[PDB]
Amino acid sequence: TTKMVSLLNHSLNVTTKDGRTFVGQLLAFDGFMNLVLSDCQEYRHEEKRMLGLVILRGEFIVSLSVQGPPPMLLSGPGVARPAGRGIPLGQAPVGLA
Amino acid sequence: TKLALQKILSKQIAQAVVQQRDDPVYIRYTPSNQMGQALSKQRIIK
Amino acid sequence: SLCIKLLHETQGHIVTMELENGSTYRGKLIEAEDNMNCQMRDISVTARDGRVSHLDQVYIRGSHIRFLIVPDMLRNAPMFKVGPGRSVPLPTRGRR
Amino acid sequence: MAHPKSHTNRSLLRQLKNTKFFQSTSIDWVEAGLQVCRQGYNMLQLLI
Amino acid sequence: ELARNVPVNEMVQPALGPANPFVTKEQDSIKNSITGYAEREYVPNFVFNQEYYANTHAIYGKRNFDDNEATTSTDLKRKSQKIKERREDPGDPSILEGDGAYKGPWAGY
Amino acid sequence: DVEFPSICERCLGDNSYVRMTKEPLGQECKICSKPCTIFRWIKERGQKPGKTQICVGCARYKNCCQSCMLDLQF
Amino acid sequence: TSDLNVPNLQMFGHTAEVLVARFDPSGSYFASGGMDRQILLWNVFGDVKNYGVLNGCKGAITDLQWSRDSRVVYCSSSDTHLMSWDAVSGQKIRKHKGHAGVVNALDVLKVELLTSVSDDCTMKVWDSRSKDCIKTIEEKYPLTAVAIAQQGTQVFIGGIDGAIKIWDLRNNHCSHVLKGHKDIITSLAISKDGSSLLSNSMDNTVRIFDVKPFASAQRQLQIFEGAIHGQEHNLLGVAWSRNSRFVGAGSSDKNVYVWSATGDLRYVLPGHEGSVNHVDFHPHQDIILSCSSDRTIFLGE
Amino acid sequence: GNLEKQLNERARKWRASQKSKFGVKRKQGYVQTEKADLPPEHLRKIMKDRGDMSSRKFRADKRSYLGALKYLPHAVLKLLENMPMPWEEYREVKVLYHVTGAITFVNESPRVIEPHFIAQWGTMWMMMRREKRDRKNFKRLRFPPFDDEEPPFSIDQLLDLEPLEAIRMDLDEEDDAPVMDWFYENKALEDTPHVNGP
Amino acid sequence: RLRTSRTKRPPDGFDEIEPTLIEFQDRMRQIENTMGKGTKTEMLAPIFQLHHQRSRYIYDLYYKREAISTELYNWLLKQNYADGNLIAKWKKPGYEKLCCLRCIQTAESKFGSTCICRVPKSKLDKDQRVRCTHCGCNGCASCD
RNA sequence: CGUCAAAGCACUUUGCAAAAGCUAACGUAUCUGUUUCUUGCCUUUUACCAGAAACAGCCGUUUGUAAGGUGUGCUAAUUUGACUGUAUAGUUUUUGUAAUCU
Numbered sequence A: 001t002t003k004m005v006s007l008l009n010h011s012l013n014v015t016t017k018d019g020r021t022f023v024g025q026l027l028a029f030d031g032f033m034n035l036v037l038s039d040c041q042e043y044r045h046e047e048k049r050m051l052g053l054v055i056l057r058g059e060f061i062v063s064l065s066v067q068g069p070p071p072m073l074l075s076g077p078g079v080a081r082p083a084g085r086g087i088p089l090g091q092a093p094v095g096l097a
Numbered sequence B: 001t002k003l004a005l006q007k008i009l010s011k012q013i014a015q016a017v018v019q020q021r022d023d024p025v026y027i028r029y030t031p032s033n034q035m036g037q038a039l040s041k042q043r044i045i046k
Numbered sequence C: 001s002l003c004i005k006l007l008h009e010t011q012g013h014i015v016t017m018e019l020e021n022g023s024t025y026r027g028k029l030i031e032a033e034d035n036m037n038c039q040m041r042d043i044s045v046t047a048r049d050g051r052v053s054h055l056d057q058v059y060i061r062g063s064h065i066r067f068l069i070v071p072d073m074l075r076n077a078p079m080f081k082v083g084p085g086r087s088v089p090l091p092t093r094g095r096r
Numbered sequence D: 001m002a003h004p005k006s007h008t009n010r011s012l013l014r015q016l017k018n019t020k021f022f023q024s025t026s027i028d029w030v031e032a033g034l035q036v037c038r039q040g041y042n043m044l045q046l047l048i
Numbered sequence E: 001e002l003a004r005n006v007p008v009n010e011m012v013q014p015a016l017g018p019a020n021p022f023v024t025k026e027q028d029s030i031k032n033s034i035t036g037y038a039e040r041e042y043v044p045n046f047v048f049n050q051e052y053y054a055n056t057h058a059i060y061g062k063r064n065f066d067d068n069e070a071t072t073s074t075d076l077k078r079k080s081q082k083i084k085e086r087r088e089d090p091g092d093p094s095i096l097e098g099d100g101a102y103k104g105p106w107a108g109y
Numbered sequence F: 001d002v003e004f005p006s007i008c009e010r011c012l013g014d015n016s017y018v019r020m021t022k023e024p025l026g027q028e029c030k031i032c033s034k035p036c037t038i039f040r041w042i043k044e045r046g047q048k049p050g051k052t053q054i055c056v057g058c059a060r061y062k063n064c065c066q067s068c069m070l071d072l073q074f
Numbered sequence G: 001t002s003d004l005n006v007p008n009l010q011m012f013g014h015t016a017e018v019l020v021a022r023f024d025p026s027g028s029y030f031a032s033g034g035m036d037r038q039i040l041l042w043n044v045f046g047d048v049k050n051y052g053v054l055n056g057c058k059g060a061i062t063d064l065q066w067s068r069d070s071r072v073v074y075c076s077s078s079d080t081h082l083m084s085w086d087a088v089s090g091q092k093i094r095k096h097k098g099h100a101g102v103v104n105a106l107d108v109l110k111v112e113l114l115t116s117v118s119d120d121c122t123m124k125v126w127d128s129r130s131k132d133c134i135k136t137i138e139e140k141y142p143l144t145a146v147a148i149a150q151q152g153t154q155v156f157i158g159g160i161d162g163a164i165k166i167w168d169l170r171n172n173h174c175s176h177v178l179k180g181h182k183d184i185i186t187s188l189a190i191s192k193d194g195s196s197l198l199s200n201s202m203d204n205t206v207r208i209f210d211v212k213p214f215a216s217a218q219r220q221l222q223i224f225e226g227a228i229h230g231q232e233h234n235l236l237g238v239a240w241s242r243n244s245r246f247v248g249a250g251s252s253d254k255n256v257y258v259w260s261a262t263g264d265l266r267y268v269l270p271g272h273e274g275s276v277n278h279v280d281f282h283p284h285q286d287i288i289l290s291c292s293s294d295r296t297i298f299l300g301e
Numbered sequence H: 001g002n003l004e005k006q007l008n009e010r011a012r013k014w015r016a017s018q019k020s021k022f023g024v025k026r027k028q029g030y031v032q033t034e035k036a037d038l039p040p041e042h043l044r045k046i047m048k049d050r051g052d053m054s055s056r057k058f059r060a061d062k063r064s065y066l067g068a069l070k071y072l073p074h075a076v077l078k079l080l081e082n083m084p085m086p087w088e089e090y091r092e093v094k095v096l097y098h099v100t101g102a103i104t105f106v107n108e109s110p111r112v113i114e115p116h117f118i119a120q121w122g123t124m125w126m127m128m129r130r131e132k133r134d135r136k137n138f139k140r141l142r143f144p145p146f147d148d149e150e151p152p153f154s155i156d157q158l159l160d161l162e163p164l165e166a167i168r169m170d171l172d173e174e175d176d177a178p179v180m181d182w183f184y185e186n187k188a189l190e191d192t193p194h195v196n197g198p
Numbered sequence I: 001r002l003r004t005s006r007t008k009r010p011p012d013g014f015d016e017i018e019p020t021l022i023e024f025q026d027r028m029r030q031i032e033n034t035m036g037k038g039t040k041t042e043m044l045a046p047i048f049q050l051h052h053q054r055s056r057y058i059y060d061l062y063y064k065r066e067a068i069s070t071e072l073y074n075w076l077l078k079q080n081y082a083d084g085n086l087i088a089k090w091k092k093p094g095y096e097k098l099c100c101l102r103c104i105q106t107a108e109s110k111f112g113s114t115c116i117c118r119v120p121k122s123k124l125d126k127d128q129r130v131r132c133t134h135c136g137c138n139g140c141a142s143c144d
Numbered sequence J: 001c002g003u004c005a006a007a008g009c010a011c012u013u014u015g016c017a018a019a020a021g022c023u024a025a026c027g028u029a030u031c032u033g034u035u036u037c038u039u040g041c042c043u044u045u046u047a048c049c050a051g052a053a054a055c056a057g058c059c060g061u062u063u064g065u066a067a068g069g070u071g072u073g074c075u076a077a078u079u080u081g082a083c084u085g086u087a088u089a090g091u092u093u094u095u096g097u098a099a100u101c102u
């Protein structure tokens, strides 16, 4: 049931046993699948009604889906200084001498 | 002036704690025809 | 249970609920239970057709509730974490 | 009573143990005491 | 500390002079110290050590002329075998005063 | 950068790779009587390590080798 | 001839040899890492200061790769691991395990696909989230460098044998090898168009090969001398210019070698105290990046 | 012949270089270790050979030996801090010494459990009161205990005597069962789950 | 270390090996008292030789001949009759015949290198096959 | 106790850094020194007397982090953290008063 947690604060449409559909933001759920929706709109048959904060029964719920993604370094030791390249007079690998 | 005076001050202050600074340094070295001979191969010294 | 906690939170306010019949109830919630049995006062019953009647004291059994319209300002109610053995969501201070 | 001030951990014996001139072992306390007395005596004698 | 990155083909960098002939062999060389030129080099320890051991081995081989050896993996064990054969046995511990007294890494030759 | 001591290659060994140590202020110059650092190295296996005997101020005024006390030209 | 405050900027930091330093694909950042088990993030324009340190790796950063999103960092560790570092927040996203030795090289894809080789003589393909190798290729001898084509079916692996092997992930038919090298291949690099392969080998020859399904034989375009390798067997990198007309390489003689890709040496600029491990070019301007085992890295023109 | 041997040798060299650079326990090519402890006979022999420093064999060490006078008081403090308590016959101390034998710091701190310490000293209180009541003739130690010109005592013959017995209450067999087996130890519960560790 | 007559009796297998440990202590005393014929460091080599021999005796008792129980062996390691760290080194490959722990530590050398006795002799010249200055070791290499 | 996640784990050595924010024991313990004042004893200095203020030192403590050591494991051990964690077809949610038409 860890997947059930992932839908908190999402926007969900829930098709119900009656046949209606509620769209709103999920605030909390329940073991009996009681859903708490905030700023809920009612989809009758489509007519729009503002509902507000809504608590659904578990039995009323048929299915649910999501319509929207969830709403919404320290330092370093290096230091830069300009410098020029110094040409050495040798041509040999560092290992070889 | 800040850097110069700070350097002098740090050198003065350094003069009891055990010194712990050990790290190898490698030097690429070039001989130069001292007593004639045939010069010498280049040397690196640890 | 967080939903039941919110329902208990509603107590004292005016909440609208509609039952399996389809009638909506407008009144003051005065009691609530874990089963969601509810007690209401000064209810204005709007039947499915639309006829408006008035009731004074009711005891609605919880098994016949479809949903409730909680007052808006309860959207900021705190959702406490519930441990395994606890049956009520409350602020916790022990291990969990 | 002064609230102790913050400072990084430093200790003479750990610094000394880091060097190659100091070794470590486990001896009886009385043997260590005799050694300390003898060493102090020798140091004072060399200074005299 | 040359500051301008420059294409290669003008890197011959000539001195452009009549090549003063009074100079002798001591000053023909460019140096910091009296003896020669020395500069830093960031060589990791392992390469320096291995090539230094190689050079020392070559010096010893030149001095003693005893250079008749090869190198391989099982050859390493085979070279160890003859030297181990020349070594006397390491005694057994708990035997202390002669007659098989234990001498391990301190066994002679 | 107090990098290297002036030592002739006759007493620096016939090995192109040598290892040597330095201890700052570990000695007094045998001419200057000034503090100076020692450099100790092994000329060759089977020989006691050599060491510098004079500061870098000397062996510059004398054009000499800090170890074997021989001039670097003749 | 660029937006740098100074034409040459020597960069200090790190406590040990630095082994890799790669520009951000956007061209505003770049990260470096080495034997000090730390990755530093830089600012190409401005104060050129550190804003982040990637601590947590339990081994030397043999190689690291920038993401196209330029927000996550993939690092190759000598401790037989591959970590994904979230650049903006500096937290460990995932640690890909599964090799059996020091993982030498790493490369990313245009699509979230990772590839790497290690001394266990194997090459592994990693999904950014699967945390496990989706595909494993087992070779006889340890491998040292990879390059993945951005089209997404061919990987070039280079190891002890001295012959670059081109593997098709889907087909598993390997009967095509870019022969020509005679020693260990230190690094590989693919062109911006994905048409040419740049290789460096410990036989002191830098060669350029063509990545095309058809060739007129002798896929060898041209070879380059001058860039030499020392006795430390370091893995020296090769780089591709933004316009893919200049090829670059590092050498153990402290010189950075830049060519015109037409066989003529152009820049041989010195400036390093030790072996030059890695080299790269800026994707927008004419900058060059240097990475050497003397605790320092240089910005270019 | 040819390819297989050449490639095996090449891989051997490459993997040797890799081991040197990224060894399992190597820091900079060398294997990391920990500074270990020497046998106590090492320091015993050092101190016997040095003696009174009246030999030319050690005349190189005199400067350091005399320079340790600066740190002598620290050694005195560390020695007095770890004095054996009355109930223990002898105490073994982790010590730190100069290879010259110049100085010898007892490298320890006398860390104790506070209730245990108070219990032990209360036990000493009762035992001492009982003995002072029962002895009836208490011969105090003479000071200084050793004669003025006596040579310092040889440790060689101090390590051969049975160390006698200390002040210890006769703990009851059943009344004091919980604390019987460890009441009079130095580091009492080092190897039990009652203390985190050494 | 030292044990009194009123101390807790050592485990069962102790009395069979007590006399040889007493003899080890006897030679340690002899080496302590014997003086001369060496430099400041050379005279301190027999100490390490005897310490290694005693620890090797205990290690041999346990791990090769199984003549002592594990309880007695742990007791011996606790009472400093054997060097725990030296045995730990002996138990891992490459260090089977380690002489002492000063010839393995690289912080005690001039150039950060292990002692000469650690190098296999097949890689060593004939001239520089000498006795170690730390303990007089004549080759710790497991191969040799 | 359970599920999930990542970290080998226990003991230990050393380095580096930090340790009041909301009035409070880094240390339930307890020394020394310097400067500026006021005192005591005082023939002059050190050594001193005992109170204050401002500063320092030493003996210790805790935490974080980095690299190692020992003993055991990786053919599993342990630790840390997180968790909306439990049964159940017999009325209050999940083993159907459904279909039928309107």
Ligand SMILES: [Mg+2]
Residues within 6 Å of the ligand: J044
């Ligand atoms: Mg006067």
Ligand SMILES: [Zn+2]
Residues within 6 Å of the ligand: F007, F008, F009, F010, F011, F012, F065, F066, F067, F068, F069, F070
């Ligand atoms: Zn000379």
Ligand SMILES: [Zn+2]
Residues within 6 Å of the ligand: F029, F030, F031, F032, F033, F034, F054, F055, F056, F057, F058
């Ligand atoms: Zn001089």
Ligand SMILES: [Zn+2]
Residues within 6 Å of the ligand: I099, I100, I101, I102, I103, I132, I134, I135, I136, I137
């Ligand atoms: Zn040894």
Ligand SMILES: [Zn+2]
Residues within 6 Å of the ligand: I103, I115, I116, I117, I118, I132, I133, I134, I135, I137
């Ligand atoms: Zn040795």
Ligand SMILES: [Zn+2]
Residues within 6 Å of the ligand: E105, I098, I099, I100, I103, I115, I117, I118, I132, I137, I138, I139, I140
């Ligand atoms: Zn040895």
